Amino acid sequence: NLYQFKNMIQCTVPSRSWADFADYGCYCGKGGSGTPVDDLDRCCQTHDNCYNEAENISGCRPYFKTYSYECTQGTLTCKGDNNACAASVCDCDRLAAICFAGAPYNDANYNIDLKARCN
Ligand SMILES: [Ca+2]
C-alpha cells in the first residue's frame, strides 16, 4: 500500500521527505499522462504503468494491497510470503524506490501545472 511505498522511499532515500515525490513531474503522484519531464518522472511513469498492470489481477488494488517486505541495511526485499498480487505490487514499489535513489531531483519539476504541461 502507499503507506508501505512511503516507507520504501524513506529507506532508500532517507535524505528526503517522501512528500518531495508525492507531486513531481507528470507521473509522480496524482498525475498519470503526458511526457515525463526527466529521469525521476520516468521512474514514476514506469511505477504507474506497473500499477495499471497489477490492477489486471483480480481483486488487486495496488494503493491498498498490504504486502510483505523488509528494508534494512540499504536493501529492500519483497518476501516470499506474497501472493501474485502482493508480489507484483511490492515489486512495482521496490523498483520505483530504487529508481528514486539514483534519480536527480530537479526542484523546478516539483508540483508543475498538470493540466497545461502533461497533455
Ligand atoms: Ca501517478
Contact present, 48 and 32 (Cβ < 8 Å): yes
Which experimental technique did the depositors report for determining this structure?
X-ray
Q: What's the CA-to-centroid distance between 82 and ligand 1, angstroms? A: 23
Query: Which residue from 100, 117, 119, 99 is spatially nearest to 108, judged by alpha carbons?
Result: 117
Q: What's the CA-to-centroid distance between 79 and ligand 1, angstroms? A: 25
How wide is the angle at C-alpha 118 spanned by C-alphas 105 and 92, nearest 5°?
60
Can you give the resolution of this entry in Å? 2.3
- Beta strands 75-78 and 69-72: pairing type? antiparallel
User: Which domains are seen in the chain, by residue range?
Assistant: 1-119 (1.20.90.10)
Which SS3 state, helix, strand or coil, does residue 74 take?
Answer: coil
Cell 532515500 belongs to residue: 13
Burial class (CB in 10 A: 0-12, 13-18, 19+), 43: buried
The catalytic residue positions are 47, 93
